[PDB]
């Protein structure tokens, strides 16, 4: 590898070919795994020279080498991405999207994804400079399979970064412009394209119900449910996040997920050996059980209540916390018969066992659930049958103890339970 001193000497020469060789040397230096000297390159003042090389239509190799050098600077810290932006790189890269050389266009796609991926402001600045139209034009072919696989993956990734980040979320008009191309990529037979399109949809559904509706209205929920069943974990993870985001919305949006067949996948998701999949599947279930009684009934009919008992009984603690939420939502919204059924599937003992957790929130959530179940037992006149039952698995003792507990609503709710029913 050249020294930065020698790179500067070549780039400052009055010889395009010497400048090209020094830019290639910079690209290779910036491409090394252990500790590329990005800040030294920036301090040498080389970004403005790279940016001017982007505009050299008559010398496509130096366009490519400087684009690659800038991509690797823009892939670093936010301060390093800012330095690239501050050199004027955004409009220069957008101009290269139309290049007849596919490797240059791809480099510009990559660079704009790094810049937009830095955060909301640079994302929106890339959009204001007009990146979306020429990016989408690169996919305006009748069959995506004629594109080079790596080229297509790069485009999908950059589009997903334009859908990414919040406060603010991407402009509504930009989302509507990008969404039809995302729908297409969601049906493309490449695992990495599918994964990144799912990530893009996961970003677009992470927000208010109006944002969810823009996605749901494009009809993608059945495809997301299909991708929930993929064997590739990199596909299932964002597809599940997208589905979980959608069921934070209205009852009608939640119903489209159920109508699409999503509940049939949850026996596997709720026992998945990847901890994060189990956690997000249980979180998703907790928002479905927060729904209407007929939606709780579909959870019942699909045999998913035993699986909720399972995750409550044994899972990573954060997953068990989501299961507690699922149970409190179920018993808050459910009919008496639905709550009786929950008790018949064995919810009481694992609920009580979690009262030993040193976590105030889950104790509150569980106490709420227990009160909800007693209210159903009152309507049936069977409060004592439930009391004896809490007693027999050791639940009374753990409720007694929380009378002596720091947090106020805990001992409040704990006290009331023992008074009224014990």
């Amino acid at each position: 590898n050249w020294s930065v001193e020698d790179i500067v000497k070549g780039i400052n020469s009055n010889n395009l070919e010497s400048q090209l060789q020094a830019t290639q040397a910079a690209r290779k230096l910036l491409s090394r795994e252990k500790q590329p000297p990005i800040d030294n390159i920036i301090r040498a003042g080389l970004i403005p020279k790279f940016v001017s090389f982007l505009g050299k239509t008559d010398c496509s190799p130096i366009q490519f080498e400087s684009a690659w050098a800038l991509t690797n600077i823009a892939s670093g810290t936010s301060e390093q991405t800012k330095a690239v932006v501050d050199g004027g790189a955004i409009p220069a890269f957008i101009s290269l999207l139309a290049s007849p050389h596919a490797h240059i266009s791809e480099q510009a796609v990559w660079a704009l994804g790094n810049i937009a991926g830095d955060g909301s402001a640079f994302r929106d600045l890339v959009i204001k400079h007009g990146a979306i139209d020429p990016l989408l034009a690169l996919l305006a072919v009748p069959d995506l399979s004629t594109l080079a696989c790596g080229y297509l993956r790069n485009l999908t990734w950059t589009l997903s970064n334009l859908c990414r980040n919040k406060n603010p979320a991407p402009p509504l008009d930009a989302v509507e412009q990008i969404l039809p191309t995302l729908v297409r990529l969601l049906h493309h037979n490449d695992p990495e394209v599918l994964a990144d399109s799912c990530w893009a949809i996961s970003y677009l559904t992470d927000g208010p119900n109006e944002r969810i509706e823009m996605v749901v209205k494009k009809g993608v929920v059945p495809q997301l449910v299909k991708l929930l069943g993929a064997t590739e974990l990199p596909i299932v993870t964002p597809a599940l996040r997208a589905i979980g985001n959608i069921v934070t919305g209205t009852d009608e949006q939640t119903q489209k997920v159920i109508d699409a067949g999503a509940l049939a996948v949850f026996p596997s998701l709720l026992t998945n050996p990847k901890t994060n999949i189990q956690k997000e599947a249980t979180w998703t279930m907790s928002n479905i059980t927060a729904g209407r009684q007929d939606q709780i009934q579909q959870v019942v009919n699909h045999g998913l209540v035993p699986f909720l008992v399972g995750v409550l009984s044994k899972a990573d603690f954060k997953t068990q916390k989501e299961a507690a939420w699922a149970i409190t939502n179920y018993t808050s919204g459910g009919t008496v018969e639905q709550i009786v059924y929950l008790v018949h599937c064995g919810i009481i003992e694992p609920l009580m066992n979690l009262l030993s957790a040193k976590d105030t929130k889950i104790i509150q959530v569980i106490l709420d659930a227990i009160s909800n179940i007693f209210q159903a037992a009152e309507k049936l006149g069977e409060t004592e049958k439930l009391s004896i039952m809490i007693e027999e698995c050791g639940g009374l003792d753990k409720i007694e103890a929380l009378q002596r507990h720091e947090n106020e609503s805990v001992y409040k709710a704990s006290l009331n339970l023992i008074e009224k029913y014990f």
């Binding site: 491409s31 991509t71 892939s75 994804g113 830095d118």
Partner: peptide, 8 residues
């Protein structure tokens, strides 16, 4: 999903 990517 990776937020930024180095081309090696």
């Amino acid at each position: 999903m990776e937020w930024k990517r180095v081309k090696g």
